[PDB]
């Protein structure tokens, strides 16, 4: 609506976590989640 | 951990798992900041 926001609101990834054996966090940044019109301007390829 | 505000009781001793980091034992073993120190099975120098 007004105040476009476009930021995380609800966390439904998982319900709970009890035991953690590893943790890692990156540096702060800001990513634009605003919608776009037209073709796909971005490409991401990952190998795991 | 060594200087934490509070420690758990002897019966309720906390089990802390440490990983995903580096350990600098030179400042710990060689600082002579503790009354007594001993190791079982491996000498402190070899552990470094």
From Swiss-Prot, chain A:
It comes from the Viruses. Changing residue 1 to E: In strain: Omicron/BA.2.75. Changing residue 37 to E: In strain: Omicron/XBB.1.5, Omicron/EG.5.1. Residues 1-18, 27-39 are annotated as: Disordered. Changing residue 44 to S: In strain: Gamma/P.1. Binds to host ACE2. RBD also interacts with the N-linked glycan on 'Asn-90' of ACE2. Cleavage of S generates a polybasic C-terminal sequence on S1 that binds to host Neuropilin-1 (NRP1) and Neuropilin-2 (NRP2) receptors. Interacts with host integrin alpha-5/beta-1 (ITGA5:ITGB1) and with ACE2 in complex with integrin alpha-5/beta-1 (ITGA5:ITGB1). May interact via cytoplasmic c-terminus with M protein. May interact (via N-terminus) with host bilirubin and biliverdin, thereby preventing antibody binding to the SARS-CoV-2 spike NTD via an allosteric mechanism. This is Spike protein S1. The chain holds residues 147 to 194 of 1273 of the full protein.
């Amino acid at each position: 609506k007004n105040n476009k926001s476009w930021m995380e609101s609800e966390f439904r990834v998982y319900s709970s976590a009890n035991n953690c054996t590893f943790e890692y966090v990156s540096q702060p940044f800001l990513m634009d989640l605003e919608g776009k019109q037209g073709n796909f301007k971005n490409l991401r390829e990952f190998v795991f | 951990v060594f200087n934490a505000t509070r420690f758990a009781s002897v019966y309720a001793w906390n089990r802390k798992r440490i990983s995903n980091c580096v350990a600098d034992y030179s400042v710990l073993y060689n600082s002579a900041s503790f009354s007594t120190f001993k190791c079982y099975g491996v000498s402190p120098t070899k552990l470094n």
